[PDB]
């Protein structure tokens, strides 16, 4: 999977302490202004995802449904 920066505190599997994924069983504590991020231990909720794209031309009707 590609791992990226944690946008909310509590978040689980994200790029928390530098470019280092904060694995499961860990919580990314978003440092406030000029304070450092701290992937502390605790259960925490993973980031969102299951993406990529927005304008896919119409494919032959039945394939899809």
């Amino acid at each position: 999977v590609v791992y990226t920066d944690c946008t909310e505190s509590g978040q689980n599997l994200c790029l928390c302490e530098g470019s280092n994924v904060c694995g499961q069983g860990n919580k990314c504590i978003l440092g406030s202004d000029g304070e450092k991020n701290q992937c502390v231990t605790g259960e925490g909720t993973p980031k969102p995802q299951s993406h990529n794209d927005g304008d896919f031309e119409e494919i032959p009707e039945e394939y899809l449904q």
């Binding site: 999977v1 590609v2 791992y3 990226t4 920066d5 946008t7 689980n12 599997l13 790029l15 470019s19 280092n20 994924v21 694995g23 499961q24 993973p46 995802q49 299951s50 993406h51 990529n52 794209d53 927005g54 304008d55 896919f56 031309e57 119409e58 494919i59 032959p60 394939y63 899809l64 449904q65």
Partner: protein, 259 residues
């Protein structure tokens, strides 16, 4: 592919696209080996944490595709899958260890200038070929950057892209990340002051990482685009499933009518 370049037509006959059947969106890449088989990276299909488990019923394969978005009526071929094999021991609750899976075409597709199967290494052209410094190849229609920065260089290519990468040495792969590294994965990228650069990215996933042979003249599928600790991140590199190290489980699922 982060800082690659638009691919020529036929540059990658074996580059398939895993298409979530509706929602309209590109889920990943895969390679095409038989003419009725497909090879992708597990997590594209089953990734428990992202509420990911998919069905034959939820995704379409497209082969000999260039445009990311355009439907290419005369060129590409959409195939409905039949089976979905995942690796008996695919470890998402860690490192994405042996993150491989075989798909199966609900028919044998017919090859074209746009469709060709890719090779699976042999102790000859794997042992001779997996020497760090050696440039591999990656193709994909994923992002040209990482957008959780509000991404300029609007990260989606409109055509398939390609970057060639050197193979990096084990020792240096482990020093990159905190994650445990297995045998079942090799990394590949530029040392951090090589000038040249490039990396795979979001949606490039479970896509080809091939190497051509000088000895015979084939394109070989060394690894699968497994995971990233930020695409084209500095002093960071990209992990690839090791195919050779699994060439063997693959075997046992093709036959299987066999044994």
């Amino acid at each position: 592919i982060v800082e690659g370049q638009d691919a020529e037509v036929g540059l990658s006959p074996w580059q398939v696209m895993l298409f979530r059947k509706s929602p309209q969106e590109l889920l990943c890449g895969a390679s095409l080996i038989s003419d009725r088989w497909v090879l992708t990276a597990a997590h594209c299909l089953l990734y428990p944490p992202w509420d990911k488990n998919f069905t034959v019923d939820d995704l379409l394969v497209r082969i000999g595709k260039h445009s990311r978005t355009r439907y290419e009526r005369k060129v590409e071929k959409i195939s409905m899958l039949d089976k979905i094999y995942i690796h008996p021991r695919y470890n998402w609750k860690e490192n994405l260890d042996r993150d491989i899976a075989l798909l199966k075409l609900k028919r044998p597709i017919e090859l074209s200038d746009y469709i060709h199967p890719v090779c699976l290494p042999d102790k000859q052209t794997a042992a001779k070929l997996l020497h760090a410094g050696f440039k591999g190849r990656v193709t994909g229609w994923g992002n040209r950057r990482e957008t959780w920065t509000t991404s300029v260089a609007e990260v989606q290519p409109s055509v398939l892209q390609v970057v060639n990468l050197p193979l990096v040495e084990r020792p240096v792969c482990k020093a990159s990340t905190r994650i445990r590294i297995t045998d079942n994965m090799f990394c590949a990228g530029y040392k951090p002051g090589e000038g040249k650069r490039g990396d795979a990215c979001e949606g490039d996933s479970g896509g080809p990482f091939v190497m051509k042979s000088p000895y015979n003249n084939r394109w070989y599928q060394m690894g699968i685009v497994s995971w990233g600790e930020g695409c084209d991140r500095d002093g960071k590199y990209g992990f690839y499933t090791h195919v050779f190290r699994l060439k063997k489980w693959i075997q046992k699922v093709i036959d299987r009518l066999g044994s």
